[PDB]
Ligand binder design. Structure first.
Ligand code: CL
Ligand code: CL
Ligand code: CL
Ligand code: CL
Ligand code: CL
Ligand code: CL
Ligand code: CL
Ligand code: CL
Ligand code: NA
Ligand code: NA
Length: 371
């Protein structure tokens, strides 16, 4: 380590063999064949020797004295061997290769894209979601000289959006699914368009845009090209989103759509659907099993311990009470809803200001007047 600072002998032979070919006058197939023989030699090495030789190969190829016709072909050939290597080795070589290509990145755009797709796949396999997404975001889909086909761009934005959802970053996921939305209609790949629709619905769900997600999931449930088991899974997602949605006209219209769909009787949450659709006041105990039916992100709680479902039930209960009574004190309204009177007033006041409940509040006497 300290006094003998040079590299491995076999990596030195590779570096040497490549330096000798740099200004060769030989024909393309002969010259490319000699570079390929050196690549096969470098690939047959086993550890630090292999890593060093493969780096010497990339460094020789990016050299401006090697014609692009050769370097593009051999860098493509080089890339085909890297997925067969251990992930830690392939990762190091992919990053090294992107770094060494950077000064001539416009000339090697095809190779950069291939490397970024393979490198992102390693980060994905290791659940390093943010690094995987960033690697794909670095592919120049619109800033390069290559005119990428629509489906390549759509597949890449969908992958980025899915990776950001895995990273619990729905705002970034939405930013990229929105770029995919501009392409999806120009695509002729129906399965990819359905994958896009599913991702878009998931992104809306993660963003707590529950009624928008419910509508998209419901529409997926109607697609006869989708297997029956997955149409029922889409319907279940639509139902859960509708229950979690903020109380009002759009939500009540979706509850009516779902209640009229006979398939909802195959879902465990049918009982809750019926009660919500009928504008019933829902008790805490009636939703414990439903709360256990939810996805992790749908169970988020604030510092006070309040969950998404807790707040949705309070809004639903307040709107339902507004249809039963002409007026009521907050003490009674709180006692009927099993919440403090101050919370009943605060949420009722918000729904009135937002236009979701018609009526007015008498703050001194603590009474809400409906209609
Ligand atoms: Cl390539
Ligand atoms: Cl971007
Ligand atoms: Cl997805
Ligand atoms: Cl269909
Ligand atoms: Cl069905
Ligand atoms: Cl909502
Ligand atoms: Cl179910
Ligand atoms: Cl269910
Ligand atoms: Na009323
Ligand atoms: Na208010």
């Amino acid at each position: 380590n300290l006094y003998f600072q040079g590299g491995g002998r076999m990596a030195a032979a590779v570096r040497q063999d490549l330096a000798q070919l740099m200004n060769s006058s030989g024909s393309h197939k002969d010259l490319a064949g000699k570079y390929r023989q050196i690549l096969e030699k470098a690939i047959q090495l086993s550890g630090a020797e292999q890593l060093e030789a493969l780096k010497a190969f990339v460094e020789a190829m990016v050299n401006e004295n090697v014609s692009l016709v050769i370097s593009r072909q051999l860098l493509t050939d080089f890339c085909t061997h890297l997925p067969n290597l251990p992930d830690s080795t392939a990762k190091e070589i992919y990053h090294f290769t992107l770094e060494k290509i950077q000064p001539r990145v416009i000339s090697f755009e095809e190779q950069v894209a291939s490397i970024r797709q393979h490198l992102a796949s390693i980060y994905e396999k290791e659940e390093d979601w943010r690094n995987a997404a960033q690697v794909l975001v670095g592919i120049p889909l619109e800033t390069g000289q290559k005119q990428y086909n629509v489906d390549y761009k759509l597949e890449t934005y969908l992958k980025i959006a899915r990776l950001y959802l895995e990273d619990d970053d729905p705002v970034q996921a939405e930013a990229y699914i929105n770029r995919a939305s501009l392409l999806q209609n120009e695509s002729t790949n129906e399965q990819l368009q359905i994958h896009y629709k599913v991702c878009y619905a998931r992104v809306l769900d993660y963003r707590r845009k529950f009624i928008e997600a419910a509508q998209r999931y419901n529409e997926l449930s109607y697609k006869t090209i989708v297997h029956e088991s997955e149409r029922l899974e889409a319907l279940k997602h639509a139902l859960h989103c509708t229950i979690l949605a903020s109380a009002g006209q759009q939500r009540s219209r979706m509850l009516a759509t779902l209640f009229k769909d006979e398939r909802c009787q195959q879902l465990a949450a049918y009982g809750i659907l019926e009660k919500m659709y009928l504008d019933r006041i829902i008790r805490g105990n009636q939703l414990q099993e439903f709360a256990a039916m939810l996805m992790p992100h749908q169970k988020a709680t604030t510092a006070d311990g309040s969950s998404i479902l807790d707040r949705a039930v309070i809004e639903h209960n307040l709107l339902s009470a507004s249809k039963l009574y002409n007026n009521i004190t907050f003490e009674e309204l709180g006692a009927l809803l099993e919440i403090p009177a101050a919370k009943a007033e605060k949420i009722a006041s918000q729904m009135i200001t937002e236009g979701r409940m018609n009526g007015f509040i008498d703050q001194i006497d603590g009474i809400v007047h409906f209609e």
